RNA sequence: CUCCUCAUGGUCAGACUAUGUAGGGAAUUUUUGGAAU
């Protein structure tokens, strides 16, 4: 538990992309399909945790080759406080100020987990609904299953009933999740390529993980954003409390 | 202002001794001390460098002409220790 | 000059007279207040116990570290 | 060995009294392992030696070779903050360190509350070493002084080792380690963490304030953005000292940084950086100058593209300061290119500077593959006999033309069309210009414009032209233009041929409508058209070219443009815009020249901030000695007269010791020449 | 503006002698209040007539149990207070 | 400019100060105040028979002259304050330069 | 380094205290000498 064992365990996370596979769904032009690069995914895996869910937003736009294809150019990492199997996330980011944003649409969001599901769980669906309630109905989700030796990209969609369910049922609600059942989620079309690449946006304070900053995190609150390199889930910037406790161990 | 100026203002009402640039010594009660060290003195006994001593009622000497003052030891307590 | 505070110091006057006393305070003009100050003239000979004294900065030539504070 | 060969294991013994082969065998043994550690270059049979970057680092920071290869393998592209301490511990200088049973209780207390986790365990000395390192960063003095002695050792050698690792990663071009290592180096230097605020390293900043900021859980950027002093005092929630804090903030480095990238060609990419420095200087706190490491790294932050150290002096702060550099791309990154590269500035001293501005690639489209120049056919047969009138054959003081000039001669001397003659400095562009001038005269034309940007070589060329060209045609007036618009106008009238810089003749020709002499100019030689790339003046010179072409189109005038230039990849486009045809254009490669010339470029370290250093000077002297011992004559170029004087005295000192001070002439002959 | 006026007044005033001394690197002789004289070159000056003097030769007059004798010594690097200056003479 | 600053530069320098009263001082300047009050250490002092003193502070107005070592670099020490004043005081077409 | 001025941030009912790319410390009471003999 705590910082030591998981943080030490974080170094091995580059090994999880040596083997990458998905259960291959039938490719269909009828619905829009996503093209995700191998570097952004790798960096997100590195920043993420073995246990706790790490989740960012993802942005991009339609290329002129196919309007139905959506290229994910810009990952947007946001203020959040993660738990095991659940996470608290801030609002939709206001990134109009930055350059290299000419009408970048909101494609969806991405997150980590350790359980292999064909559907989105309650803690995920409720969060999805809270983010996108009245804002974008057809946005997608990327659920990354992560285990030592390989990772798996499980994409998902959502229908209009799930948003209502998330609006009504936020805290706890395990039975209404059970009744919610597998069916509502629909497996979205996602691809992994080395033929394109992308970049990250990060908050102005450059601390995206508010795990141990409990007072500073605000679930609805404004933040400035900037381009940069994101940090590790357990990184010196994310663990300031530990230094005052470390020197406080000897005291004075 | 000077801290010794502040002490010297505390010395008002006491008996002090004054040596001037000429060397004459004036002992008496200090009436008034300005910021410029000009001092008003009462009932002064004066000892000249030749040794002759005189008495005078009211004397006022310029600051610039004073070599030094000696003030009573009462003031040494405070608050200039800080 | 702040390090010299509380020390026993020897001040040489304009007229050549030597004063010795504890340095309690100074100011911009280098007016010094000297506690338990005594005067020596020729070098002990002609030594007098003055007591608490101010000295003017216009008259002061130099000061040296005499002894440690009381 | 000489004294007792078998004691120290000389096998050679009777053989080689001087132990030549024993010495050489040890050298072989050394250079194998060194080469394995990529410290030096070596070849067994050919036997050539040169030093590498890693070897230079080991030399500078005096790292043992074992420590060196340990760094080599244990450092990786993906290595993280946890692994950095482990590698530091693995450094061979700690081989003699071992854990102790009286140390063990304090170790146990530490490793619980240690911020940076340890993959190893209490029994292992490496773990003890890096926890001592952590304590040192965190300022922990100790009671049990065994630990404190070890941490003294770490105090003296730690910034060394860490700084070495950082330099190594920087040479390797690895993004994840280099930034974290730079932070660690800073932490060894200034003794603090990132989470401890940078206000700690100010000597005048008080203790209560820094405690309050540590405990306030606030991003550093916000405090830096705060301006109003009273508002800073309110933000730091103590009304006292706020003004002091704000003063010290403006004494903390703050940079408004911008970068505009732009491709030169498809492979080469030039970055124009605008680096502004807003902070106010202090000689006490900042020191002599501010070294700032400028990192150009990829979109992930994985590998380093390009790096440089730059010195911000007291003079630069507040000025708008541009910095330029070039980078060649990869093959795949050439084909498909990223959304942006990250440009990050970090202070080698100041904490949490961290200014990273994205270098924007959005729809940057690279140009086409470079087209090769027109081929050089094998023909020598063109000579001075081919030209029509034989008075023009007494000019060139040679008979047979060059290989490159023979190629252009047909379009040049015979026809009147617009010619891009093109390339090379050595191959005479002067000669080709002369031929063009003769062709122009031959048709009873008479107005000629020879334009070179270099005003000193214009004068030389005038001195050579007026004594010879002018008298053969027999009337022609060759002149150079002066600063006056009026005087150079009267010259524009009086003179058949005008020689001027682009600035001069553009200024005179700006009114073509009003000066009708300039509407009538039939022939032009644009000499060194490759200098249109050069700064604003090149832009002036293309303004002149564009103006002339606009005059040709507007007036329906036949104006023969002879564009003389250097080797240019984009040359054909340049000729196209000038009213030319692909057949008329002649572009050649630099390798086409007739005197094969070895360009030997040699790179040295820490030279970016200086005109020259002492190794450069030695190598120059060695080259000069090679030339002087040979029959060749040699020359060296220098930035200033001051630099020339310095190098001259230096050369004399080098020469006086060695055999050659030689002037190849007696010492009594030289004074008669230098009498003045 | 004030700085400009001060420098100018200094240039056209009596100060012009010590300004001219620094620029020409000419020797000047200074009659001091100690009844000693300093003939030297002016390396630097001040409004108070504080001066950095090089190649100092100071000349003085001493009385003994017979005829008055002049005495002199060389001080290569000398810095001088401004109040000791009675007179600064510039000459060939 | 102000020569007193030039004296401020003179810390850790061995000097012989002649004084208005005629006193000769020999010692290493620890500091000089802007008043030109000079504090020195390891001082041999001769009043107009030398007295050896750990530390001596002299009031600036009493200083007649201070004789500096001949090794001192006056060219370098004199020019400071002007540079400090200059530091206190301190579009397309930018690159005259090209590629 | 020190005192003043000024600016400032704070506190108290003008004073005090930290900081300052600040100005200053030659015309009567102090630091640019009425001292010299």
UniProtKB/Swiss-Prot annotation, chain B:
Q: Where in the cell is it found?
A: Cytoplasm, Cytosol; Nucleus
Any one cellular component term from GO for this entry? Answer: precatalytic spliceosome
Q: Decide whether keyword ATP-binding is in the record.
A: no
Domain (Sm): residue spans on this chain: 3-75
Keywords, A to Z, come to: Cytoplasm, mRNA processing, mRNA splicing, Nucleus, Ribonucleoprotein, RNA-binding
Biological processes, Gene Ontology terms: 7-methylguanosine cap hypermethylation; mRNA 5'-splice site recognition; mRNA splicing, via spliceosome; spliceosomal complex assembly; spliceosomal snRNP assembly; U2-type prespliceosome assembly
Please provide, alphabetically and separated by semicolons, the GO molecular function terms listed in this UniProt record: mRNA binding; RNA binding
- Give a yes or no for keyword RNA-binding in this entry: yes
**Purpose:** Plays a role in pre-mRNA splicing as a core component of the spliceosomal U1, U2, U4 and U5 small nuclear ribonucleoproteins (snRNPs), the building blocks of the spliceosome. Also binds telomerase RNA and is required for its accumulation.
Assembly, in brief, is:
Component of the Sm core complex, present in spliceosomal snRNP U1, U2, U4/U6 and U5. The core complex contains SMB1, SMD1, SMD2, SMD3, SME1, SMX3 and SMX2 (Sm proteins B, D1, D2, D3, E, F and G, respectively), and is probably a heptameric ring structure. SMD3 specifically interacts with SMB1.
Q: Which family does it belong to?
A: Belongs to the snRNP core protein family.
- Write down what this protein is called: Small nuclear ribonucleoprotein Sm D3
Which organism encodes this protein?
Saccharomyces cerevisiae (strain ATCC 204508 / S288c)
Q: Which gene encodes it?
A: SMD3
Swiss-Prot record, chain C:
Location(s) in or outside the cell: Nucleus; Cytoplasm
Q: Where is the Sm domain?
A: 1-69
- Look up the signal peptide feature and give its range: none
Q: Which family does it belong to?
A: Belongs to the snRNP SmB/SmN family.
Miscellaneous comment: Present with 861 molecules/cell in log phase SD medium.
> What domain comment accompanies this record?
C-terminal extension may function as a nuclear localization signal (NLS).
Question: What does this chain do?
Answer: Plays a role in pre-mRNA splicing as a core component of the spliceosomal U1, U2, U4 and U5 small nuclear ribonucleoproteins (snRNPs), the building blocks of the spliceosome.
Q: How does it assemble?
A: Component of the Sm core complex, present in spliceosomal snRNP U1, U2, U4/U6 and U5. The core complex contains SMB1, SMD1, SMD2, SMD3, SME1, SMX3 and SMX2 (Sm proteins B, D1, D2, D3, E, F and G, respectively), and is probably a heptameric ring structure. SMB1 specifically interacts with SMD3.
- In Swiss-Prot or TrEMBL terms, this protein is called Small nuclear ribonucleoprotein-associated protein B
Placed within the complete protein, the shown segment runs 12 to 102 of 196
UniProtKB/Swiss-Prot annotation, chain D:
User: Which annotated residues bind ATP?
Assistant: 423-430
Q: Where is this motif: DDAH box?
A: 527-530
**What residue range is the signal peptide?**
none
Which domain of life does the protein's organism represent? Eukaryota
Q: Where is the Helicase ATP-binding domain?
A: 410-586
Q: Which residues form the SEC63 domain?
A: 51-361
Q: Where in the cell is it found?
A: Nucleus
Q: What else is known?
A: Present with 1440 molecules/cell in log phase SD medium.
Give the family per the record: Belongs to the helicase family. SKI2 subfamily.
Q: What is known of its domains?
A: Contains two helicase domains. The N-terminal helicase domain has catalytic activity by itself, contrary to the C-terminal helicase domain that may have a regulatory role and enhance the activity of the first helicase domain.
User: Oligomeric state and partners?
Assistant: Component of the U4/U6-U5 tri-snRNP complex composed of the U4, U6 and U5 snRNAs and at least PRP3, PRP4, PRP6, PRP8, PRP18, PRP31, PRP38, SNU13, SNU23, SNU66, SNU114, SPP381, SMB1, SMD1, SMD2, SMD3, SMX2, SMX3, LSM2, LSM3, LSM4, LSM5, LSM6, LSM7, LSM8, BRR2 and DIB1. Interaction with PRP8 is important for recruitment to the U4/U6-U5 tri-snRNP complex.
Reported function? RNA helicase that plays an essential role in pre-mRNA splicing as component of the U5 snRNP and U4/U6-U5 tri-snRNP complexes. Involved in spliceosome assembly, activation and disassembly. Mediates changes in the dynamic network of RNA-RNA interactions in the spliceosome. Catalyzes the ATP-dependent unwinding of U4/U6 RNA duplices, an essential step in the assembly of a catalytically active spliceosome.
Q: What is this protein called?
A: Pre-mRNA-splicing helicase BRR2
* Species of the source: Saccharomyces cerevisiae (strain ATCC 204508 / S288c) (Baker's yeast)
Q: Which gene encodes it?
A: BRR2
From Swiss-Prot, chain F:
Cell compartment(s), UniProt: Nucleus; Cytoplasm
Which InterPro entries does the UniProt entry name for this protein? LSm4/Sm_D1/D3, LSM_dom_sf, Sm, Sm_dom_euk/arc
UniProt keyword annotation of Repeat present: no
Domain annotation Sm: ranges: 2-72
GO molecular function terms here? mRNA binding; RNA binding
- One Gene Ontology cellular component: U4/U6 x U5 tri-snRNP complex
Predominant cellular place of this UniProt entry's protein = nucleus
The source's superkingdom equals Eukaryota
4Fe-4S: present as a keyword of the record?
Answer: no
Keyword annotations for this protein, in alphabetical order, are: Cytoplasm, mRNA processing, mRNA splicing, Nucleus, Ribonucleoprotein, RNA-binding
Instruction: Choose any GO biological process term that the UniProt entry carries and state it.
Output: mRNA splicing, via spliceosome
Pfam name, any one: LSM
Q: Spell out the disulfide connections.
A: none
Q: Which residues cross the membrane?
A: none
* Role: lays a role in pre-mRNA splicing as a core component of the spliceosomal U1, U2, U4 and U5 small nuclear ribonucleoproteins (snRNPs), the building blocks of the spliceosome. Also binds telomerase RNA and is required for its accumulation.
Family per similarity comment: Belongs to the snRNP core protein family.
Quaternary structure, per UniProt, is: Component of the Sm core complex, present in spliceosomal snRNP U1, U2, U4/U6 and U5. The core complex contains SMB1, SMD1, SMD2, SMD3, SME1, SMX3 and SMX2 (Sm proteins B, D1, D2, D3, E, F and G, respectively), and is probably a heptameric ring structure.
- Swiss-Prot/TrEMBL domain comment: C-terminal extension may function as a nuclear localization signal (NLS).
The note filed under miscellaneous reads: Present with 2400 molecules/cell in log phase SD medium.
Designated name of the protein: Small nuclear ribonucleoprotein Sm D1
Species for this entry: Saccharomyces cerevisiae (strain ATCC 204508 / S288c)
**Top-down, what is the taxonomic lineage of the species of origin?**
Eukaryota, Fungi, Dikarya, Ascomycota, Saccharomycotina
